[PDB]
């Protein structure tokens, strides 16, 4: 990890010795970060990986620019959001409406280019369908935190090459009608969670099968994003030029170099949390 001057390194040695007392008298003792500890009860022999806990804050002082005090209030609200949202539940315990799991794809490829190993997948195109799952904004948004929550179950934090995800929206099938601001809840919903709570977890995120003709959909959400995520957008109106960006995605629809099996045969369906998460996930169902 890479500092451009000791006063960084400086905030980082400072935030990882405060980290104790933070976690203990503002977020309620709560330290799952993205399914792993960073809280050093001497069970912490066994739980408590200390190049991961480094790794994930140096993450998040990147994202906040260094700024100490920031870093610290932006560590509070992820973990106290942790506690009271549940992500860890929201993918490995809740139940989601059938046809939402049917448009979530999870993929890794071993082999794959750096940070484009671990995938998620949007078929939000197949949904204009049925503009019901967007009435229960709350339900939805459970369901994608649980999309999210299970890729960063295929990172390797402390790796070079797998510490951050991909994504991918398809979109085929949108009619520029059909636009309602049911949709517009949602996205902004979601993407409020991702900006505030996500940060340094994306290295790139690509919209195919999109018309032109939507370009003021693109120029309006655009604006709740920040320019760092917003430099990792690509859109693509042909899907099947894809696989120029991820090597080894489907050759059908995404022009990849699997030509064995499509993205449902690519699918990952044994999930299993991390060690410590599955720790504070049963933990948590004995106080009821
Ligand atoms: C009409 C059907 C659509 C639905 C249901 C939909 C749904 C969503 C949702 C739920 C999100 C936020 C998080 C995500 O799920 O990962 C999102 C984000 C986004 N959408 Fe869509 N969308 C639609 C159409 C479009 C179109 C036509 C475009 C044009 C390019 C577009 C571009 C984007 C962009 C740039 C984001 C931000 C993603 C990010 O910040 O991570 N969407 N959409």
């Known amino acids: 990890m890479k500092f451009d001057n000791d006063s960084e390194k400086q905030v980082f040695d400072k935030l990882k010795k405060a980290i104790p007392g933070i976690i203990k008298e503002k977020c309620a003792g709560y330290d ?6 960073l809280n050093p009860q001497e069970e912490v022999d066994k739980y408590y990986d200390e190049k991961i806990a480094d790794r994930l804050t140096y993450k998040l002082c990147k994202a906040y620019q260094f700024e100490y005090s920031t ?3 932006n560590l509070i609200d992820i973990l106290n959001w942790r506690r009271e949202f549940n992500p860890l539940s929201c ?10 799991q049917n448009v979530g794809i999870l993929t890794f490829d071993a082999n794959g280019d750096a940070n484009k190993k671990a995938v998620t997948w949007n078929l939000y195109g197949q949904l204009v369908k049925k503009k019901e799952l967007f009435q229960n904004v709350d339900k939805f948004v459970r369901y994608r935190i649980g999309l999210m929550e299970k890729g ?11 510490n ?7 979109y085929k099938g949108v009619s520029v009608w059909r636009m309602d601001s049911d949709i517009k809840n949602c996205s902004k919903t979601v ?12 290295y790139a995120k690509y919209f195919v099968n999109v018309p032109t003709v939507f370009g003021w959909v693109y120029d309006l959400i655009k604006k709740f994003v920040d320019e760092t995520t917003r430099k990792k957008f690509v859109v ?14 489907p050759y059908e629809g995404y022009g990849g170099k699997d030509k064995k099996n499509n993205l449902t045969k ?3 369906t044994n999930v299993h949390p991390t060690e410590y998460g599955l720790y504070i996930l049963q933990k948590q169902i004995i106080e009821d």
Do not use: R, W
Request: with cysteine.
């Open 71 to 73: 870093i610290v209030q």
């Open 266 to 268: 690519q699918n990952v």
């Open 152 to 162: 960063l179950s295929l990172l390797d934090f402390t790796s070079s090459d797998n």
């Open 191 to 202: 993407i409020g969670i991702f900006q505030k709570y996500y940060p340094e977890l994306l």
């Open 236 to 249: 693509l109106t042909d899907g099947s030029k894809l696989g120029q960006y991820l090597k080894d995605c």
């Open 164 to 170: 951050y995800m991909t994504q991918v929206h398809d």
């Open 32 to 37: 799952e970060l993205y399914g792993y500890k």
């Open 91 to 100: 993918a490995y315990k809740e139940v989601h409406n059938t046809e939402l």
